[PDB]
Nucleic acid binder design. Sequence first.
RNA 1: AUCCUUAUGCACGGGAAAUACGCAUAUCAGUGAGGAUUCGUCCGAGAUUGUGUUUUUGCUGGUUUAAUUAUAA
Lengths: 74, 636, 49
Amino acid sequence: SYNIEDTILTLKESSIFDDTDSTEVLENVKAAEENADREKLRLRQMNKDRRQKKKILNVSSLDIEEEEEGLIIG
Amino acid sequence: SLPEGSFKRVKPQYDEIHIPAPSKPVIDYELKEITSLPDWCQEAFPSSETTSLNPIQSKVFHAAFEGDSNMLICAPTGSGKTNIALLTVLKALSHHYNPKTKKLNLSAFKIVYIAPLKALVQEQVREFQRRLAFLGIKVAELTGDSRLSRKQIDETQVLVSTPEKWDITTRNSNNLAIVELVRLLIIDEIHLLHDDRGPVLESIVARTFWASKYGQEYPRIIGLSATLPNYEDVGRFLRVPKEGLFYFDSSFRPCPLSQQFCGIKERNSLKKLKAMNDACYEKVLESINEGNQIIVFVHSRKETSRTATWLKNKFAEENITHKLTKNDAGSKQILKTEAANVLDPSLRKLIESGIGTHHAGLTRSDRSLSEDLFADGLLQVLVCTATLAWGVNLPAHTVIIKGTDVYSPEKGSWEQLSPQDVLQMLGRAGRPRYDTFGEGIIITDQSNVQYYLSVLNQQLPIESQFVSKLVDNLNAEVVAGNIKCRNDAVNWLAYTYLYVRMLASPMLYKVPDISSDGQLKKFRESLVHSALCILKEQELVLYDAENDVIEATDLGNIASSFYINHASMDVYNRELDEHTTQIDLFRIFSMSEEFKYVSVRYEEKRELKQLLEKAPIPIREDIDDPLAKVNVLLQS
Amino acid sequence: SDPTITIKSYHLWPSFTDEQWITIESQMRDLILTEYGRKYNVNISALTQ
RNA sequence: AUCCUUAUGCACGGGAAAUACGCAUAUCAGUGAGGAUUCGUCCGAGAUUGUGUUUUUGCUGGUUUAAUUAUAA
């Protein structure tokens, strides 16, 4: 009943027992792979930049933690 | 095609096809000598080595004095063009300058020479000074780093300008007296129309015909170009009388260009690159044993240094001594004097081996040095980016073009070498003054060879890119006040170079109208509509759809004056704000569209990193983003 | 594009010859390769097979 | 001229195996090797010895950013 957004919305992937009783979301098929491919792309170009240019990242606690950070009636 | 390929060699790494040198010209003509000239014109060729003009020149020259008409020369540009332009200049000078009375009439005639590049402008200017010194003429540069003011233009007679600055000078309303005074408008390299600067030339051309009707005396227009197809359509673009058109093929070239390809059969880049280096090495080995001075073009400037390193360790592995076996004492001397003194991109060692390189990103002094050393000949091999073919006249016997894919920020993708660039790279060749013929070579992937054969035959029209520059040119013209309506706009667009090209091939350039509107009235008017919508959105000009009235705004006037692109303009429009501050000003400056082609580099990155720490004006963006690099360079 | 190419009552996709498919598959690959990059700001040409 | 049988060579297509394929200035062997039998007989070409390689022979593929230049002074 919770939404994320002439458009169609489908159920997002969720584990049966891990989900159990929890709020369920409705996302667009193209939007899910859209966001995923944007983030993972941003990771790929940073992979090629890191390995090619041999730069060491600052990162650590707060950065990696913030990387861990990453209704309709019908 | 069959005559073009005579002979083909098959090699393990690559299949090389060797095109024979072009044919020598048939003589139906007399070689025109210097003593046939009048009294003052005999110093046009102060050093007369032949005392006879080249195969191209004589006929075009006497035709040029005979008619006063718009002319076009499609030629190898074998140094033949410089003298022809000089001679037409002297004619105009004589028309305003009496044969009996030797006082030169200074205030009557004015002359303009449109040379695309600043450097080539410089070179030209020294040439014109040398040849025109006897009349007592001031030949000075109007463009860019030239920095001529309001007065010196009035003082001067002969002008040598780049297209951009000449456009901006003639666009301005106050000078129009000077524009009227110019009788002689020379356009060098009219083949530039293919490239995106060419839009400026066609706009200048349109302004010359259409904009001055109140004085209405049309100046003499002389196009000078590399040989190109659709010459007739070019004339219909300009005026050209049929007789002024002179089409000369590469058979009239001073040094016949021996065309050569290596197709590369490999696919993956790690072996493919190695195969290319092997082929280049093989060609260099064939050349240097003959005493051949050689240039190797590449895509990128970073490629140059690593290529030269590869030639040093590989070439030296084969034989170290043969590159310099002669005057090794003086070679050591001059080499250490040049390399050790002014060079600091770790390029000294390459110079020291005697395989050098030249690229944008090499110091201005170091740059001049490399040119001179390669002229003397202590440099047997010269690795280069695309700067030299475009800029500098210095030919070298063997010319290798390594690779196909160039990265253009226009697309943001790797495209093929564009024909107009390939051709001008092939232009520099065996030296017309000294050597008999040139060796051209193209290191390339075999699949695209079929394409490069044709585009290398120069069968490709000068493509009209006016679609991008239309809007800005139209805005500037409205600022001039010449267009009050859509009909005026399309009449101006009739003298535009895209107009002709549309007429020739409507579906190629996406004319939907086709059979309808032979004059493409509605197509022209539709483009004007499209332009004036976006202009009005950018508050550049006033427009109404049904009533159709045009007027220029202040922002449009600013864009006209400082020649800002329309994209840059709307970027300024939104990004500038009431509350915008010192930090945001640099950011907007960086956002200016003229920096779209700028990008950060890995050899630049260390100095960038050192800068952005101690930079006084902070940067909201970061080292990877080109905008930040731009405004930190601005701070520096 | 071509209305002369008719989907029957039986089929889903329209009936072509082979070479018509050979071109259509290139046109379909073009949308994929252009929109993947355009969305992710990636150039088409630099891509490995 | 067509059609068919056997043997051999080259070969498109389809399988199976590599505890399998070979080598010997070496010993024998249709002038009888090696077996079988219902005890009358019957089958008829390898056997020994040494050795090479044998979860492997050759070859490949993937993955681990061009140049140029524009202001009003």
